[PDB]
Write a protein that holds these residues in place. Sequence first.
Motif, PDB file in Angstrom:
ATOM      1  N   UNK A  73      36.974  62.439  30.789  1.00 42.18           N
ATOM      2  CA  UNK A  73      38.760  61.933  30.190  1.00 42.18           C
ATOM      3  C   UNK A  73      38.681  60.441  30.194  1.00 42.18           C
ATOM      4  N   UNK A  74      37.693  59.928  30.693  1.00 46.36           N
ATOM      5  CA  UNK A  74      37.413  58.357  30.767  1.00 46.36           C
ATOM      6  C   UNK A  74      36.630  57.761  31.249  1.00 46.36           C
ATOM      7  N   UNK A  75      35.714  56.764  30.733  1.00 43.76           N
ATOM      8  CA  UNK A  75      34.353  56.193  30.747  1.00 43.76           C
ATOM      9  C   UNK A  75      34.340  54.918  29.999  1.00 43.76           C
ATOM     10  N   UNK A  76      34.344  54.321  30.094  1.00 45.35           N
ATOM     11  CA  UNK A  76      33.191  52.590  29.954  1.00 45.35           C
ATOM     12  C   UNK A  76      31.381  52.929  29.533  1.00 45.35           C
ATOM     13  N   UNK A  77      30.926  52.522  28.915  1.00 48.24           N
ATOM     14  CA  UNK A  77      29.544  52.383  28.228  1.00 48.24           C
ATOM     15  C   UNK A  77      29.461  51.105  27.572  1.00 48.24           C
ATOM     16  N   UNK A  78      27.842  50.439  28.070  1.00 44.54           N
ATOM     17  CA  UNK A  78      27.277  49.254  27.145  1.00 44.54           C
ATOM     18  C   UNK A  78      26.799  48.948  27.875  1.00 44.54           C
ATOM     19  N   UNK A  79      26.875  47.704  27.698  1.00 45.67           N
ATOM     20  CA  UNK A  79      25.603  46.936  28.166  1.00 45.67           C
ATOM     21  C   UNK A  79      26.717  45.474  28.405  1.00 45.67           C
ATOM     22  N   UNK A  80      25.807  44.714  29.581  1.00 44.38           N
ATOM     23  CA  UNK A  80      27.302  43.594  29.783  1.00 44.38           C
ATOM     24  C   UNK A  80      25.604  42.356  30.480  1.00 44.38           C
ATOM     25  N   UNK A  81      26.689  41.068  30.479  1.00 46.08           N
ATOM     26  CA  UNK A  81      25.414  39.737  31.292  1.00 46.08           C
ATOM     27  C   UNK A  81      25.238  40.787  32.323  1.00 46.08           C
ATOM     28  N   UNK A 169      34.887  55.665  35.465  1.00 47.59           N
ATOM     29  CA  UNK A 169      36.349  55.911  35.525  1.00 47.59           C
ATOM     30  C   UNK A 169      36.896  56.700  36.235  1.00 47.59           C
ATOM     31  N   UNK A 170      38.508  56.257  36.721  1.00 47.17           N
ATOM     32  CA  UNK A 170      38.852  57.071  38.148  1.00 47.17           C
ATOM     33  C   UNK A 170      39.574  58.869  38.084  1.00 47.17           C
ATOM     34  N   UNK A 171      40.066  59.419  38.789  1.00 50.47           N
ATOM     35  CA  UNK A 171      39.533  60.696  38.993  1.00 50.47           C
ATOM     36  C   UNK A 171      41.334  61.104  38.871  1.00 50.47           C
ATOM     37  N   UNK A 172      42.078  60.663  38.927  1.00 51.20           N
ATOM     38  CA  UNK A 172      43.652  60.553  39.168  1.00 51.20           C
ATOM     39  C   UNK A 172      44.491  61.719  38.564  1.00 51.20           C
ATOM     40  N   UNK A 173      43.533  62.621  37.547  1.00 48.71           N
ATOM     41  CA  UNK A 173      44.630  63.792  37.004  1.00 48.71           C
ATOM     42  C   UNK A 173      43.936  64.620  37.613  1.00 48.71           C
ATOM     43  N   UNK A 174      42.246  64.884  38.267  1.00 51.67           N
ATOM     44  CA  UNK A 174      41.522  65.507  38.711  1.00 51.67           C
ATOM     45  C   UNK A 174      41.159  66.710  37.404  1.00 51.67           C
ATOM     46  N   UNK A 175      40.969  66.444  36.372  1.00 43.52           N
ATOM     47  CA  UNK A 175      40.092  66.396  35.488  1.00 43.52           C
ATOM     48  C   UNK A 175      38.770  65.465  34.915  1.00 43.52           C
ATOM     49  N   UNK A 176      38.033  64.302  35.540  1.00 41.66           N
ATOM     50  CA  UNK A 176      37.501  62.797  35.405  1.00 41.66           C
ATOM     51  C   UNK A 176      36.101  63.315  36.599  1.00 41.66           C
ATOM     52  N   UNK A 177      36.331  64.069  37.053  1.00 41.28           N
ATOM     53  CA  UNK A 177      34.886  64.090  38.126  1.00 41.28           C
ATOM     54  C   UNK A 177      33.502  64.403  37.951  1.00 41.28           C
ATOM     55  N   UNK A 178      33.258  64.510  36.901  1.00 38.07           N
ATOM     56  CA  UNK A 178      32.228  65.415  35.659  1.00 38.07           C
ATOM     57  C   UNK A 178      31.012  63.414  36.112  1.00 38.07           C
TER      58      UNK A 178
END
Length: 185
Positions: A73-81, A169-178
């Motif tokens: 349900x929620x994630x961030x992806x990319x690159x960083x310094x 991401x967080x899993x406040x919803x119970x739908x973002x554990x994957x």
Amino acid sequence: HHHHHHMVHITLDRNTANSWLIISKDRRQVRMGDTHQNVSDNKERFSNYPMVLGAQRFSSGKMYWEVDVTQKEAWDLGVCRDSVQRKGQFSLSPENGFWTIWLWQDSYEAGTSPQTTLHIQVPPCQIGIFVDYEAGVVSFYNITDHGSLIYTFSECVFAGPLRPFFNVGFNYSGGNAAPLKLCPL
Ligand SMILES: O=C(O)COCc1ccccc1
């Protein structure tokens, strides 16, 4: 796209992980646990968010990898310094050393300042990430939709070595554990 031949084998760096993350034995998958994972604190760990870096550092060349985001349900992806802030609150922006996209509340956005709406007709199950160090480019591709372009950051000012960047991401919803999973070449 035709960037597949720049494929690199990414592994996750345990030492940079938030203390609630669980990284698989092969260092190719990460998920957020339901509690602290019984690790010591260190100055590398992201303290406020469920973030981790890849072990690889890039200072030249062209690099490509793919990430599986199935059922999240929620994630961030990319690159960083390599030198991004680890402790406290911060925004994901190129000014702060991040070149990222995310899913949040059923919309996709690029981590510009302010954030940019993405136009995705086919919700992606796997994301491709392309970095051209010399050109100053980071591009994102929808593998589920035959590799269609999601977003290009151009005129990037990397200003140092780059690391693959992940937020489960967080899993406040119970739908973002994957988990996030690094997909085979
Ligand atoms: O709300 C939660 O699920 C966990 O809170 C503690 C925390 C864990 C990781 C990062 C920031 C705070």
